[PDB]
Ligand binder design. Structure first.
Ligand SMILES: C[C@H](CCC(=O)O)[C@H]1CC[C@H]2[C@@H]3CC[C@@H]4CC(=O)CC[C@]4(C)[C@H]3CC[C@]12C
Lengths: 11, 240
């Protein structure tokens, strides 16, 4: 559900 | 017996942990200072601590054999739900039964029931959390078993919002099958006695702790005045 930070840390 | 793949998985999980869990706790100095006097005096410090730990659990998750084959959405979903549980699990390493506390290298960074209770969460959570720590500690897991459990904990197919659960499950089964085998060949009796069932039960205990943590969070985070003491990562992961 749009987790920019979580998304960026997992990339 | 332990195949080459299984031994490979264990080597990988052990290194991932070594790279994400600092037993010297040198970074704790970067967190907002702890305040033991309580108007949520420990929230700033523990909030930063948890936030930092979320980052470290993510780093660990990324190195789980097979985690990279999941989609971004599933990866986010698994970490969002598992973070708190994995932090509770990895904390067993600093938890000592001598004085029922998390001894993170020094007085200032040694948290007990009262410190951990000075951050907006009630004994509805803390009591069960310590009990968990004690029982997990009493399983005397090999470090090998510890990292496999955290990995298994993260890649659970029944987490809320999972999409390709079949893949999540396949990935988990590989870790789960590696664990069951490791116990049978590397953990001697009697400590090995129903060790797997005991470890899985702990995963159910974590689900319970997770559930309670959520309620405690919605509560704490109801007053914008309190959501202010938290970090951006914590708000995004737990609830903003
Ligand atoms: C200091 C402990 C970790 C030690 C380690 O990583 O070795 C961490 C792991 C479990 C954490 C607790 C998880 C539940 C909540 C989360 C919060 O917002 C801070 C207050 C609570 C009550 C936490 C306090 C700090 C603890 C006890």
């Amino acid at each position: 559900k749009n987790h920019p930070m979580l998304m960026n840390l997992l990339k | 017996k332990l195949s080459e793949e299984q031994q490979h998985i264990i080597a990988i999980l052990l290194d991932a942990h070594h790279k994400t869990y600092d037993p010297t706790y040198a970074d704790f100095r970067d967190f907002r200072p702890p305040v033991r006097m309580s108007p949520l005096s420990m929230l700033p410090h523990l909030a930063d601590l948890v936030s930092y730990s979320i980052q470290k659990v993510i780093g660990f998750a990324k190195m789980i054999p097979g985690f990279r084959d999941l989609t971004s959405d599933d990866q986010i979903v698994l970490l969002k739900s598992s973070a708190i549980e994995v932090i509770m699990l990895r904390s067993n390493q600093s938890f000592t039964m001598d004085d029922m506390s998390w001894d993170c290298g020094s007085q200032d960074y040694k948290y007990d029931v009262t410190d951990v209770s000075k951050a907006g969460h009630t004994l509805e959570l803390i009591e069960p959390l310590i009990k968990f720590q004690v029982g997990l500690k009493k399983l005397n897991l090999h470090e090998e078993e510890h990292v496999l459990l955290m990995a298994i904990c993260i890649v659970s197919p029944d987490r809320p919002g999972v999409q390709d659960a079949k893949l999540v499950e396949a990935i988990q089964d590989r870790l789960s099958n590696t664990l069951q085998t490791y116990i049978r060949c590397r953990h001697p009796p009697p400590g090995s006695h129903q060790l797997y069932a005991k470890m899985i039960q702990k995963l159910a205990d974590l689900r319970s702790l997770n559930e309670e943590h959520s309620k405690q969070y919605r509560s704490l985070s109801f007053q914008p005045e309190n959501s202010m003491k938290l970090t951006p990562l914590v708000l995004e992961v737990f609830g903003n």
